[PDB]
Design a protein around this ligand. Structure first.
Ligand code: HEM
Ligand code: HEM
Ligand code: HEM
Ligand code: HEM
Lengths: 142, 145, 142, 144
């Protein structure tokens, strides 16, 4: 669970990086597809999946809108992300290993873009947060 | 694992550009903080009480530097990685009994600290080659398990 | 999260097998240390780990007492098992990979001992419960 | 991996006490129920939408029997498991893009169904050797 310390840390970090959310989402999604190509088949209905391609850029923004929703719903991620869970865990049957992969790519991109803000303390709180997001997305598997 | 000339150059450039004395302690400190059960394997290394302690711990720092020099061995022999880490695999299995899942976690921490150091030059294709290399290394480290 | 369906399933199975809890725990702990001998080091401070160890038998009872506590606290496992988490996750620094190993060994033993009660449906609910127990035990890592 | 004369006998003994037609469908059914994201790989296999349907599905059943026959080849050539599973690794870990975590999950369901069938004969030492065998198989199915 997220302590108040963790929530404060995530909110402060988000306050510093949210203006860059479109770019974060495009880079993160681009890296999941090329660094972990097993995920490409989830998006095969879009023909150009190169880094920064129109569909990747657009969906990157969508993903980060889901992260901003999670920050607003940080006191109850499971309730907050229920619809997103029904889509990912039940309708799309995304393998939960892939939630870990996208979470890792988000942390790599935030570390790359905001090295001074992404301290070891910010890292452990945001990883606890992304673990909480991933578990919330896993709510409707079974 | 086969490698192209460009993959070899990319791995050489990523590691060639790093200060192992800076990156090693950060990568290992972050693993001990973010995945703190890994502290169970560092019982002779001093204070691991909290993030400040770990980051200030010079025994941990020196060990992180040793890890990067160990990776350097694979950088300089990219076709012989399974062979070159056979002894290290035994070390991690038989002395420490470390679950191989944790090798991926230290590699992930390394990638995060490299990304912060390298900036946008750590582009997605560069990360893909680096993860490929780290996967070969992690597979070589669990082989003797 | 556990649904009312899962909770009924777990309560029902436990009510049928709890009378053999001592044996379930000895069998499960015994299997963990033989089948996954990386876990032996956690108990090396006891004088005997061999098959039939008295210390293994006694601790198997202790562990299933923790399961019995979790069944009674099934509506709030994080709080119910907070003290056990401080011990496991913070003081002992148990690798969370090992919570999955013991959970698997407990399922193997219940399957073996109670094959007609251990339906696929009982299995999915009890695995969700053991996953929640493992997550509750991981509360105090970080 | 090294194998002892007793380990080979033990693996041979375990598989010879099983009916693959019984165990195969039980193991795969359980995996698809307990770890239902794995259904994403079985779209052309018919009804998967609840447990009753999966347990009754004879296409799933046939496939689980195929898995047991595929393990039998390994039982038979224990020092070359990595090689005879070469093509299956490409299948699974290239053509179908199955995350390898899932190989462990199916092996765990098999162990659970084998333990119910064998009862007390599946003692801790037998389990230990069975798991050592499955770990070899899982690795072989693993990338490269
Ligand atoms: C941090 C974890 C993730 C978050 C926050 C997230 C967020 C989102 C959001 C906000 C949507 C749009 C919902 C809608 O269409 O109404 C979406 C759709 C989608 N997600 Fe994710 N997602 C996550 C992880 C993943 C992963 C790991 C995969 C697969 C590898 C994935 C695959 C998809 C697909 C296939 C779609 C639908 C795209 C389409 O419109 O065709 N998601 N996700
Ligand atoms: C990518 C994964 C890893 C790599 C490349 C790696 C590399 C190394 C190297 C090169 C050494 C010996 C250094 C020297 O003496 O020159 C070493 C030792 C050690 N490693 Fe790792 N390691 C990995 C993961 C881990 C993890 C995940 C843990 C803990 C959970 C760990 C714990 C240790 C410990 C405690 C030692 C010292 C053992 C001794 O010699 O007494 N390592 N590792
Ligand atoms: C996930 C299911 C588990 C449950 C319900 C459980 C339950 C318990 C309980 C009830 C105790 C006694 C606490 C006390 O009063 O001292 C205990 C202690 C302990 N557990 Fe667990 N445990 C679990 C998993 C594990 C695992 C996976 C390991 C390591 C492989 C482990 C290692 C220990 C150790 C080393 C102690 C203390 C032994 C001593 O007294 O020296 N536990 N556990
Ligand atoms: C780790 C234990 C496993 C073993 C020994 C195994 C074995 C087999 C074998 C022998 C075949 C038949 C090959 C052929 O006739 O072409 C097969 C096919 C297949 N396996 Fe597995 N498998 C394992 C795990 C899994 C898992 C965990 C999944 C997915 C969740 C998976 C998905 C598939 C699919 C989709 C096919 C058939 C493709 C099709 O007919 O459309 N397997 N497997």
């Amino acid at each position: 669970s997220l302590s108040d310390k963790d929530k404060a840390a995530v909110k402060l970090l988000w306050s510093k990086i949210s203006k860059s959310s479109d770019a974060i989402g495009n880079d993160a999604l681009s890296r999941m597809i090329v660094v972990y190509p097993q995920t490409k088949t989830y998006f095969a209905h879009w023909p150009d999946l190169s880094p920064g391609s129109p569909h990747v850029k657009a969906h990157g923004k969508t993903v980060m809108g889901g992260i901003a929703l999670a920050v607003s719903k940080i006191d109850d991620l499971r309730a907050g992300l229920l619809d997103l869970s029904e889509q990912h865990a039940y309708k799309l049957r995304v393998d939960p290993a892939n939630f870990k992969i996208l979470s890792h790519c988000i942390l790599v991109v935030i570390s790359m873009m905001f090295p001074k803000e992404f301290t070891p303390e910010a890292h452990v709180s945001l990883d606890k947060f992304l673990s909480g997001v991933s578990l919330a997305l896993s709510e409707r598997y079974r | 694992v086969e490698w192209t000339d460009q993959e070899r150059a990319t791995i050489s450039s990523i590691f060639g550009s790093l200060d192992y004395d800076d990156i090693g302690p950060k990568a290992l400190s972050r693993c001990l903080i973010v995945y703190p059960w890994t502290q169970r394997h560092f019982g002779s290394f001093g204070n691991l009480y909290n993030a400040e302690a770990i980051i200030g711990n010079q025994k941990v720092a020196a060990h992180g530097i040793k890890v990067l020099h160990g990776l350097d061995r694979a950088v300089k022999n990219m076709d012989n990685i399974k062979e070159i880490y056979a002894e290290l695999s035994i070390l991690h299995s038989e002395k420490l009994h470390v679950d191989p899942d944790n090798f991926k976690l230290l590699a992930d921490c390394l990638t995060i600290v490299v990304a912060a150091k390298m900036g946008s030059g750590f582009n997605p294709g560069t990360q893909a080659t680096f993860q490929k290399f780290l996967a070969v290394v992690v597979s070589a480290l669990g082989k003797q398990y």
